[PDB]
Protein backbone atom coordinates (compact mmCIF):
# COMPACT_ATOMS: atom_id res chain seq x y z
CA UNK A 1 0.00 0.00 0.00
CA UNK A 2 0.91 3.68 0.16
CA UNK A 3 3.97 4.36 2.30
CA UNK A 4 5.66 7.60 3.39
CA UNK A 5 9.36 7.12 4.11
CA UNK A 6 11.10 9.49 6.51
CA UNK A 7 14.83 9.20 5.85
CA UNK A 8 17.63 11.06 7.62
CA UNK A 9 21.29 10.37 6.81
CA UNK A 10 24.74 11.78 7.32
CA UNK A 11 25.93 13.61 4.20
CA UNK A 12 29.41 15.14 3.80
CA UNK A 13 29.73 18.90 3.93
CA UNK A 14 30.75 20.72 0.75
CA UNK A 15 32.03 24.22 0.08
CA UNK A 16 36.20 12.36 11.16
CA UNK A 17 35.30 14.50 8.13
CA UNK A 18 33.09 17.56 8.02
CA UNK A 19 29.54 16.21 7.91
CA UNK A 20 25.94 17.30 8.16
CA UNK A 21 22.51 15.65 8.35
CA UNK A 22 19.87 15.78 5.63
CA UNK A 23 16.28 14.52 5.39
CA UNK A 24 14.63 12.92 2.32
CA UNK A 25 10.87 12.45 2.71
CA UNK A 26 9.65 9.95 0.12
CA UNK A 27 6.16 9.08 -1.17
CA UNK A 28 5.08 5.83 -2.80
CA UNK A 29 2.48 7.07 -5.29
CA UNK A 30 1.42 10.31 -6.95
CA UNK A 31 -2.08 10.12 -5.44
CA UNK A 32 -0.82 10.31 -1.86
CA UNK A 33 1.73 12.97 -2.81
CA UNK A 34 -0.83 15.25 -4.45
CA UNK A 35 -3.09 14.65 -1.46
CA UNK A 36 -0.37 15.75 0.97
CA UNK A 37 0.92 18.57 -1.27
CA UNK A 38 -2.01 20.11 -3.16
CA UNK A 39 -0.90 22.97 -5.41
CA UNK A 40 -3.58 25.44 -4.38
CA UNK A 41 -3.95 28.59 -6.45
CA UNK A 42 -3.94 31.66 -4.17
CA UNK A 43 -7.45 32.88 -3.36
CA UNK A 44 -8.80 35.79 -5.38
CA UNK A 45 -9.07 39.18 -3.69
CA UNK A 46 -12.80 39.81 -3.10
CA UNK A 47 -14.81 42.49 -4.86
CA UNK A 48 -15.15 45.44 -2.49
CA UNK A 49 -18.87 45.78 -3.20
CA UNK A 50 -20.60 49.16 -2.99
CA UNK A 51 -24.24 50.04 -2.41
CA UNK A 52 -25.87 51.12 -5.71
CA UNK A 53 -28.25 53.47 -3.85
CA UNK A 54 -25.85 55.55 -1.75
CA UNK A 55 -22.39 54.41 -2.95
CA UNK A 56 -21.26 53.41 0.54
CA UNK A 57 -19.19 50.32 1.44
CA UNK A 58 -21.58 47.41 1.16
CA UNK A 59 -22.68 45.87 4.46
CA UNK A 60 -25.44 43.50 3.33
CA UNK A 61 -26.88 41.73 0.31
CA UNK A 62 -30.58 41.29 -0.35
CA UNK A 63 -31.55 37.59 -0.47
CA UNK A 64 -34.13 38.08 -3.22
CA UNK A 65 -32.36 40.30 -5.76
CA UNK A 66 -28.80 39.43 -4.62
CA UNK A 67 -27.92 43.15 -4.72
CA UNK A 68 -25.78 44.57 -1.90
CA UNK A 69 -26.97 47.59 0.06
CA UNK A 70 -25.89 49.73 3.00
CA UNK A 71 -29.02 51.10 4.71
CA UNK A 72 -32.69 50.38 5.33
CA UNK A 73 -33.72 53.16 2.94
CA UNK A 74 -31.56 51.50 0.29
CA UNK A 75 -33.35 48.21 0.97
CA UNK A 76 -36.77 49.82 0.60
CA UNK A 77 -35.79 51.58 -2.63
CA UNK A 78 -34.25 48.39 -4.03
CA UNK A 79 -37.34 46.33 -3.26
CA UNK A 80 -39.65 48.93 -4.80
CA UNK A 81 -37.46 48.93 -7.91
CA UNK A 82 -37.46 45.13 -7.99
CA UNK A 83 -41.24 44.89 -7.79
CA UNK A 84 -41.59 47.51 -10.54
CA UNK A 85 -39.05 45.69 -12.72
CA UNK A 86 -40.69 42.30 -12.21
CA UNK A 87 -44.04 43.86 -13.10
CA UNK A 88 -42.59 45.37 -16.28
CA UNK A 89 -40.76 42.17 -17.26
CA UNK A 90 -43.68 39.87 -16.45
CA UNK B 1 5.57 35.19 10.20
CA UNK B 2 3.62 36.06 7.09
CA UNK B 3 0.75 35.25 4.80
CA UNK B 4 1.33 31.99 2.93
CA UNK B 5 1.79 32.52 -0.81
CA UNK B 6 3.16 29.16 -1.99
CA UNK B 7 3.79 25.66 -0.62
CA UNK B 8 5.60 23.99 -3.52
CA UNK B 9 7.64 20.89 -2.60
CA UNK B 10 11.05 20.48 -4.24
CA UNK B 11 11.28 17.05 -5.87
CA UNK B 12 14.61 15.27 -6.28
CA UNK B 13 16.22 11.96 -7.05
CA UNK B 14 16.98 9.98 -3.93
CA UNK B 15 20.72 9.30 -3.64
CA UNK B 16 8.45 10.99 -5.26
CA UNK B 17 11.23 12.21 -2.97
CA UNK B 18 11.39 15.80 -1.72
CA UNK B 19 14.47 17.50 -0.30
CA UNK B 20 12.84 20.83 0.66
CA UNK B 21 9.45 22.48 1.00
CA UNK B 22 9.43 26.09 -0.17
CA UNK B 23 7.14 28.49 1.69
CA UNK B 24 6.57 32.05 0.50
CA UNK B 25 5.55 34.49 3.22
CA UNK B 26 4.22 38.00 2.62
CA UNK B 27 4.05 40.92 5.04
CA UNK B 28 3.34 44.61 4.53
CA UNK B 29 7.08 45.19 4.22
CA UNK B 30 7.75 42.55 1.58
CA UNK B 31 8.02 38.87 0.70
CA UNK B 32 10.48 36.10 1.56
CA UNK B 33 10.90 32.49 0.42
CA UNK B 34 12.08 29.90 2.94
CA UNK B 35 13.82 26.58 2.22
CA UNK B 36 12.43 24.52 5.07
CA UNK B 37 13.32 20.98 6.08
CA UNK B 38 10.93 18.51 4.41
CA UNK B 39 9.82 17.15 7.78
CA UNK B 40 7.83 20.38 8.28
CA UNK B 41 5.32 18.87 5.86
CA UNK B 42 3.63 17.08 8.77
CA UNK B 43 3.08 20.30 10.71
CA UNK B 44 1.79 22.17 7.66
CA UNK B 45 -0.98 19.63 7.08
CA UNK B 46 -1.60 19.30 10.82
CA UNK B 47 -2.20 23.05 10.99
CA UNK B 48 -4.10 22.79 7.67
CA UNK B 49 -2.11 25.68 6.21
CA UNK B 50 -3.27 26.87 2.79
CA UNK B 51 -2.53 29.85 0.57
CA UNK B 52 -3.87 32.99 2.19
CA UNK B 53 -3.21 31.91 5.79
CA UNK B 54 -1.15 33.92 8.24
CA UNK B 55 1.31 31.57 9.95
CA UNK B 56 4.43 31.85 12.07
CA UNK B 57 7.36 29.43 12.25
CA UNK B 58 9.79 29.51 15.15
CA UNK B 59 13.46 29.10 14.30
CA UNK B 60 14.35 26.68 17.10
Amino acid sequence: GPIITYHSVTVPLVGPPARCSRTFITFSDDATFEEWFPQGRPPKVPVREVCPVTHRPALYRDPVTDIPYATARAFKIIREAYKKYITAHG
Amino acid sequence: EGEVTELTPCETENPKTISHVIIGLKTAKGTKQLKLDPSIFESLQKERVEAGDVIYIEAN
Binding site: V9, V11, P12, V14 | E13, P15
Partner: peptide, 10 residues
Amino acid sequence: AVMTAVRAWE
Protein backbone atom coordinates in the same frame (compact mmCIF):
# COMPACT_ATOMS: atom_id res chain seq x y z
CA ALA C 1 28.04 3.50 -4.45
CA VAL C 2 25.82 5.08 -1.80
CA MET C 3 28.47 7.62 -0.75
CA THR C 4 29.23 8.64 -4.34
CA ALA C 5 25.52 9.18 -5.01
CA VAL C 6 25.17 11.18 -1.78
CA ARG C 7 28.04 13.42 -2.87
CA ALA C 8 26.73 13.73 -6.43
CA TRP C 9 23.38 14.84 -5.05
CA GLU C 10 25.01 17.29 -2.62
